[PDB]
Symmetry: D6
Subunit: 167 residues, 12 copies
């Protein structure tokens, strides 16, 4: 069955391969990086930084994706969620299960009150998967991302602890 | 007439006095601080950090407030705006003029495409001043801030470069 | 009226005097200290450590005591509380008022779920103060502290967020 | 026969595996860690820190678990005890034997006056093991740990030097 | 098909060979270097410097050249472009294709307003390539470079964002 | 008579005032700075950097402006020139005299082959000053600077060693 | 009445004056020192070292001597005791009272099991004062100290916690 | 024949194996250590420290034990002696020969005036071997060591240079 | 054909072998060195130092010598020249060709105005090769070098850029 | 009478004032400097560097000039000599006396074999003073210095130990 | 009466004046120094170095000279002695009295076996002083020091512990 | 034939073996060392220290001994000499030949005026070797070295430059 495990430094190569194929502008603890050694230096720099928690999503000891809890705020008890899945594993529905795992970790382990995520308004699939797992649309950010030649809006969706526990 | 000038280290005391009276949870380059020496250490640490630009708002060589451009993104050309004015100067309408100064700096000097801000949904004054100076409501963030005993929603408002230049 | 303000480095001298007359074995972020320069070095070392919050409790710009929230756990949302009042102010009831200030900060600002404290079972007046302000006895720790020649029991008392909000 | 030996750096991998399968929120000298390199850096940082002693409990040159004496206070002569046994060894009674080993070390080598431990009140089998080896119930901590979705009480149990020497 | 990928540290050897056969006076973040270890030290020093972006241009997992965006100015939104192709690949037109790749990255990802480059006025084939891909002649710099015994003029050529988007 | 002297650290305050009233986006060894302590740290960091030479232009022990030779290239023997005069001294012709001083230093002391400068094409009075002192127009840079709301062209002007020596 | 207080860095001068007149071979955390700046550097180096505790002996806010607990062993619960009194205060019997204060601190605060001291066998006064306050002779060390031209034996005397508490 | 040689870092493993089997509380330049990497760090820290000299005791290039001269005092010309022999080599009488080697080194090379050692009063074998090689009983230290559940006295024995040279 | 290439750190061994057989007093950036690790440390220390440029002289990927441009003065545009050739390659006339290569680099790449060298007045071969390639005698330095038992004079020879370009 | 004394850091200001009025290109341990703080940093960096010795030339506790022994070679026993005298003291003949003092120091204290100096061939005064004190012309360096618009030759003069001692 | 006291850092100025008027080539822990800041840096570097002991010799709280014990060898128990007295005090015999003070310190405190000193064979008055206080001539070192133009012999004189104790 | 070569770091092992079998108290730049890593650290620390020169004396690429020039004084032009030959080579006369090699280096390369050495007066064969190669007896040092139980005299022998050149 699908599993989460803490992200190890030895896994960074895999992570890089991910961020290579999906996009070109990747960040680590909100600092931008392009090359693998950049990613390694940021990892070493933020080794004990508790503002972000990252998990490898595994299927029978096989690395199939990455879950990221970023901008963790332990006073307002909220965190932003980001998920990436290897395109060699699309169709198995792993996105929803990994999102559910991350929801369980954030609400049941981290004792968070709110989870939120931001998707491009073109990616209607992402909006449907996230509505599937229980997210509600919270806002529409105007020209939030300059994507390949022009500005794109984004959908911010959110979900809360007590709503999650009762499902 | 009202003026902006670059924030100097020697001004930090004033800043602290501000953040003392208005709230209790203050940040510097997204790191939290309580005491004055904490603020000084963060200032020294982020001295050349260009992700945030801060200005003292002056009235005839008198310090009346603070303007902050934070989360500056030079690729997506956006920045978040925060303003604080000494309560010994409320009524003179300095909030709107300082916001206009910051708008001019961000759009005409920094060449930003978008400015946005976030206010508590209780502060209906802030919503009206910002609508006055031309901001449009962009979203409503749900239980975004734990404020003195319970969660509060927030209004995210925004404004764009070309809209600004034509007014 | 009685108020809290963030502990500044320039206040450490006052703190030292307190911990000198009241106790002889004092700690700073769980490290022991005796001399003033020890306290200063510990302060500088733990300047941004968010596991402890310290406040000077002031009466009309006069320093009257110290409030400490220590062992702050932002996942289990609990913190231990320690209070010291200058013995030149007994009778004004400043202990209970400062404890109430600290309760408001912990429950309404820090969003804590539980506050707890430990007192010597000899000091029945502290137990009476804390029962007054709403703490409940939670346990009795056996021979927890070696006090002036022999072991003493201690009372662990606690209070919870919603019970505080309903009173 | 079962034995203790000092924890070596080369053993950390084993330790990690333990803390991975048993828990997800693990600490090293009261600092939290998730990944293996985090554990290694914390180990290196607290190499000579005498506030904690850790032992590998071995059965015929085979690593079967971990004993931890933490929060060692050499003035009040007390320490908290934590034990972990690989779940591949339930039934051999290794928990009680390792706990007895740790008692002998703490009382006969460290010259401690008191040992205490904290267990979830759900795990009645740990309470039974510790009552077997001579621990007495000392207190019940209310909502001390947020465990998988809700707060749990905890049992604090303790044992003293002369009572151990007479048994 | 021809592609760009982020320059890795492990690629520096290839880069060196390029800059050795093509030129003898090479720079890295505007600091001069001759030997391989010089290049490595400069790379390590400017690892997170965002004023330059470098890409390996690859043809079917084979390293065929180097693209450099230097003097990146995120306020005036302009960058200088430099291209190198292994002389073992003349005729395949890789210069123009790599330049087009770099244009797409600069205008569509970096949100740049202007790209410019400087060529020796002797190399009319580079001027022809750049005119092909859409660059316009902007100026003639007088005796800008001392080349093999005497001074040479240089052609500064440029291209703008909307003109690129409409072609 | 007007004279040049080496820029001292104790002069930085004056420099700041200049760059504050004249511009808002100022650089030091091509790194941007806003506040005074930023300028001081940059000065200390580039103390022995020989790529830039800065002089205070003085009139009878009175500080009247700043001359900067930047981007000094000792192989191609060229340098860019920047001049600032306190606006309290317009009419005395100090700009041209200071520029002549800088020409003498660059051509007769530094043994430079070429001097160049860049001006906004709006400022026809600077172009007139520089044409007076012997500079020739070399090029027109298109939309090189984003100035107060829109892009401006710039004039690049230059002068050579032997032409200077024969005049 | 006579008092102990923690040794402050600002007191080191006084300490030096002591160690100047009594002997010529003085140590700080078992490292030898002669000059005042040597003493200051050792103090700074061992600032948090808990193997030695030092107290200023005060008479009505007047510095009259020094108490030192050295070679503190928190496992075997023993410490060596050293006392020095300003010769401008001999006759008042301050030696015995300061020794009694130090005994109370070691046995009642530090929870020590044994105190011991070593005196030259010539100093028969020291042997009588220490026998007065309850020390028993424990051993005679042969040629233990080379004193001003020849070797001297030493008397090691000791006293235990339970013996102290019952007097 | 039996030999001494300087202790090398590469020998530390052997040393650890010794201190593992004999006792559980081991020190290096008076700092306590448990694990092998702790021992290595202390060795590196005190590499040039001349207050202790350590020798490997060898029998035909085979490591059979360890000799330690600690607390070396070059002014009073004395040193404490400690010897450990692998229990796989008991019976060959190597203890006395290694002690004789160390005596020769201390008196004939180091020019020491006095050697002393401390043994548990239970180890009557150690007292007889040391009396055999010429040590005289010097004192009996009361409850000097907390050994496995209760306090033990110790015998301090010593021997002098001129007495040694004449035997 | 004979070639120059930038000196790499991996070549230092070869260099050492050279400086071993020819002389005994060798320098690196004017600091003296004897052993190989000394040379490596100097190389690492002066890695980016542009006051000296060194080239390996190669014959068909075979290392046959070393060219050194030292005391490079970019203001007076002069540099001292030193050449060393492996004695296993004497007779092929490589000295003159390597000197010609270095002349071309200094005059045509570095834009130097003057090259000079210093030879022992005994080495009449060196004077003839250098006169062959176009050097003119510039001076005779008296007792400039203490060579193997007595002082030797030296011949300083020089050549200029324009003289070189016209041959 | 005229005196030499070791150059103190507190004298650097005077030195700067010298190097300000005479020339514009000044060096310290062969590194170039312009500003006073540059000179201070070089002084601190080369504080124990014995390759250069500098003396203040004093007339009745009044600072009148500077003597520099540079490029000191302790193997070939030679040093270059440089002298600067305040123009407010020209005519008193202090140049020759300071040169004689420096000659005595170099030959009689430093045990040097040769002193040499280099002067511009225009300064015929310097050649006559140095011939006066006993220097012999050793060489004429061609276009050695680029001086204010064109190249100048230099005269290198020298003098030897035994010649000096016999006068 | 004449006395010794440990050399303080604040005394270095006095020391400098001494070594300036008496000599010109002075050393500190065998490193050479000329200027005052050199002496201060050397002092700070060798602060805890026990190979040298320095004393100010004082007459009624007035600084009259310097005593130095250098090259202290605690194994061979020997030290070299150097003495300096302000020339404003010749006739009072302070040299011999200070030398006797130093003898008492070396033989009675440091437990040295031998003291030795080296004087120029010209100074027969120092040889007479040292013969007076009990030194014996031990050797004549040939051309040991280059003194003001030529080599001088030196007298090495010595004294031993028991001979001192019997006089 | 016998030759000298510069001591490399990779040779230290050999050196250690020498100093182990010949002596037990060995020094490196006058700092004492026992173990191999001590020697390595001392070597690394004094890598560029020019006060000592060390050579491996080799016979046909075979390491046969060590030559050391220590206490090199470049002002008084003297150095102490120390020689060690592997005892597996007695009879070949390598001591005298290596000493002659060292003489040639010191007098003909280093331009030294005097060489001196110190031998135990017991070793008459070293005195005979050194008298053979031209050393003259200069002095007899009394009880200079504590050797294996008692003090020994030493012979100081020397040789001068011109006497060497005439033989």
């Amino acid at each position: 069955d699908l599993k989460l495990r803490p992200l190890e430094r030895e896994d960074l190569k895999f992570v890089h391969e991910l961020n290579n194929n999906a996009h070109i502008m990747s960040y680590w603890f909100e600092e931008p990086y392009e090359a693998f050694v950049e990613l390694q230096d940021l990892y070493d720099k933020h080794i004990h930084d508790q503002s972000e928690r990252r998990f490898i999503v595994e299927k029978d000891n096989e690395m199939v994706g990455l879950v990221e809890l970023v901008e963790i705020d332990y006073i307002h008890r909220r965190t932003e969620f980001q998920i990436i899945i290897d395109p060699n594993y699309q169709g198995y529905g792993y996105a929803a299960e990994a999102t559910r795992l991350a929801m369980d970790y954030a609400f049941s382990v981290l004792n968070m009150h709110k989870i939120y995520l931001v998707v491009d308004k073109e990616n209607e699939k992402a909006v449907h998967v996230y509505k599937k797992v229980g997210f509600m649309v919270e806002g529409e950010l105007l020209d939030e991302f300059f994507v390949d030649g022009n500005y794109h809006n984004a959908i911010r969706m959110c979900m809360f602890q007590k709503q999650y526990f009762e499902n």
